[PDB]
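Hi both,

Apologies for the delay on this - the queue was longer than expected. I finally got the 4-(1H-imidazol-1-yl)benzamide-bound model through. Below you'll find the protein sequence and the ligand SMILES exactly as submitted, and right after that the structure tokens for the full complex including the ligand.
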Amino acid sequence: GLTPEQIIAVDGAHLWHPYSSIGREAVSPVVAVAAHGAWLTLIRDGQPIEVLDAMSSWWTAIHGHGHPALDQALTTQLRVMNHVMFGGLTHEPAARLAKLLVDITPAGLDTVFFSDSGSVSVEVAAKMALQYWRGRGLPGKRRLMTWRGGYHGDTFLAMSICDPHGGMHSLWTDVLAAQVFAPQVPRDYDPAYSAAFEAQLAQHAGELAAVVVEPVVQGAGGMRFHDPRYLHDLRDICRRYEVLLIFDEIATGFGRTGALFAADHAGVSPDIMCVGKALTGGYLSLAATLCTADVAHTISAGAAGALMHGPTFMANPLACAVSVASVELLLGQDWRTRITELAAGLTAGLDTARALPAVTDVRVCGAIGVIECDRPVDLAVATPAALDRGVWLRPFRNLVYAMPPYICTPAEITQITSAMVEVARLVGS
Amino acid sequence: LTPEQIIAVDGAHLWHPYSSIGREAVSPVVAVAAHGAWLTLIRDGQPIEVLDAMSSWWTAIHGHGHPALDQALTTQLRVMNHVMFGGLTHEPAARLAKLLVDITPAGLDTVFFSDSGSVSVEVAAKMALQYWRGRGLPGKRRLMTWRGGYHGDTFLAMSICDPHGGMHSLWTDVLAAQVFAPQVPRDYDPAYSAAFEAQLAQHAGELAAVVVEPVVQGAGGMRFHDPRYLHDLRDICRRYEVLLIFDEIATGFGRTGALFAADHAGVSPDIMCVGKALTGGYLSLAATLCTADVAHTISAGAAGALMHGPTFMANPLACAVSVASVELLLGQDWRTRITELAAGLTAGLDTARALPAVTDVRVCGAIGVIECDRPVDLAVATPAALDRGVWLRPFRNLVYAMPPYICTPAEITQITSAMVEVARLVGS
Ligand SMILES: *Cc1c(COP(=O)(O)O)cnc(C)c1O
Ligand SMILES: *Cc1c(COP(=O)(O)O)cnc(C)c1O
Ligand SMILES: NC(=O)c1ccc(-n2ccnc2)cc1
Ligand SMILES: NC(=O)c1ccc(-n2ccnc2)cc1
Ligand SMILES: [Mg+2]
């Protein structure tokens, strides 16, 4: 047992945080001591205060924390089977979840590879793509193509298709695989962008295993939105030039952008798909990589005869069980109307931010609200400003944004947006 | 779902480790329960109890459904399932970090939590690369290892896997080109270390780190080597200014008879990875530890930070059960437990040495191995072990076990008896 002060002491000495230092943090992390529904209990000046989890804990907590149905699913599975190895054994949570995911994902994604994080699921997607073309007798097709502004995770192959600036590739000279980057995909649909992307792809087609993109929304690379019709064009380009299409839906999946999956906005299916973050409703790490029967059969028929990947905790019963509950909970309600209301709430509440001196854009897509500023947002100022108003917000770069739990009431959304609106005001000092 | 329905869904839709879709020689066996050292599996439509001789791929050190670990999970579930580690910290992460810093080899002062072993290896490599960039030596960017190793399945991890065992022939022009020393021998041979140093000497200016599994190499072949080699590696790495990384994802938390396999040599690496048994086999979790000097150098470098951050970094539920698992291990006489387990394996596997198809029998802590003279046919071996009440999963030419620490002497003998009969059948 440790007090908040003791936690801070241990943390500062011994704990790495995401993209952080040891010993050079400008501000200490804030101690979290509970989470329930849409609210975190955090320690501020020795006192526990409840604040809205406007970030959904990095996109994960779509049903809120400690949802009784999700809690119950975990405890139920715990009493029967915590985990067995997936080498040579199978089980009901894996079967149930696989059945669900093949049913609700874009058409044609018939096989499911479970892994333990988004970054791994992306490396598995790349491995599927490369083994596929090797199974077609085309080992030269081994490079990846993407558009700038993207984020696909933190492992070294995942890093190679991250935005070169966002991903700090200048720090990684001579270390990463050299991939093919198209320019930043624009917000508004412009057929010339797609025509250009096609011409670039065409000259590399004999080298390319796959195009890998985030559909409709680019998350960690800048919270940018693009017209779904671009995805339609990619599916077409990939089809005609024989390059696989991979959609990374680790941030966009399970309703977040107003469709069940963001691909559904465009009405197209990728050859391979990754899901992750919200898969377990934010309870546990789990990810999945889906692919078509053709991809699966070609890999399996190749000289290698198998997909050469197998995580230790592949298809963990506990994580699978809570995911099944989380997916069913989403599907068992009018989620489409819920997200529409949230999007309306976000738009209404963020509207006055457009007139602010430091704001360059306000944009909303489903349960995603963004205020883009003209300068970097000072965390040392923004974080306590939002906490003062009962909201946990984590800006990055020039972005004040939120992806709130789907269970947030209108009053809660009013609270979140007011805090966001106030944070941007302080930005414009 | 019924077992038959599970099998039908599984065949149509589920990938398994290193498997095909639609071309599996045998269906997987449906598991419907696990308690203690025992799995309940469906065989010919009927449930059977069998020993989890594999500890579910080396994870279940305390067995399944242990009341202390079950309750740690449900206690944490009541308070806080998870919060983002960006900007927040919490009690389970601090408790686990404190524990890990205290029990790992001396000097490992900082802890980076991630969700799997492969990722923890990638994080280790990132630490080493950012370290040398922080020292103004970005040329130090390659890795050196010895053959026979396994470090995970993500693409940097694959680059230090044994080139034959990791099927590098099938990844031509795709993987980072690393430096490989020959297979480390079982017995200590000064000439091997001398040659290792000579090879490293030729590449020192471009090497960020030596990365090895200490004492036991797992998935690459269940090979044991003399701990004195680790002493030599530490020495070589210090003199040539190359970081030393130990991958203890399979060897950690008592499995080789010491708390960490490094302890067999008294050696501290600069960076260390742990996983598989960290949560007692409940949930995916892994950790990468590094020294204060590595942490400070990265932190004072151009990036000013380690450029990595998993979504579920330091997940409160996984951390909470890991705290419980580690405390449960430390709070008992685990050294005597593993010694007794090793003696049981040694005694039980002895008659295998005489079998016509057996080339070696070897035991290291709670690891017992029969090495055969041919690849073991799973279609024969799995049901032969199930017929004797044991879940055994051979790979390559190896019939082996890494049993839960809670196995009784009678259960260990039941496991070794099954292993012997499997080895007998291999020679048939
Ligand atoms: C968060 C994210 C990832 C990586 O997931 P981790 O679980 O943090 O490794 C990959 N791709 C996208 C689009 C993401 O948003
Ligand atoms: C199992 C293992 C890994 C990989 O861990 P995953 O959790 O399967 O990614 C890495 N290194 C060693 C030594 C292992 O035994
Ligand atoms: N590297 C391997 O060949 C391997 C094999 C089996 C597994 N595995 C994981 C869970 N069950 C089997 C993991 C890795
Ligand atoms: N879990 C987190 O809170 C977190 C924060 C930042 C990131 N991040 C930042 C840049 N790239 C990833 C990832 C995870
Ligand atoms: Mg409240």
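Main takeaway for now: Residues A 85-87, 310, 312, 314; B 17-18, 57, 219 surround 4-(1H-imidazol-1-yl)benzamide (ligand 3) (CB under 6 Å).

I'll put the files on the shared drive as well.

H.
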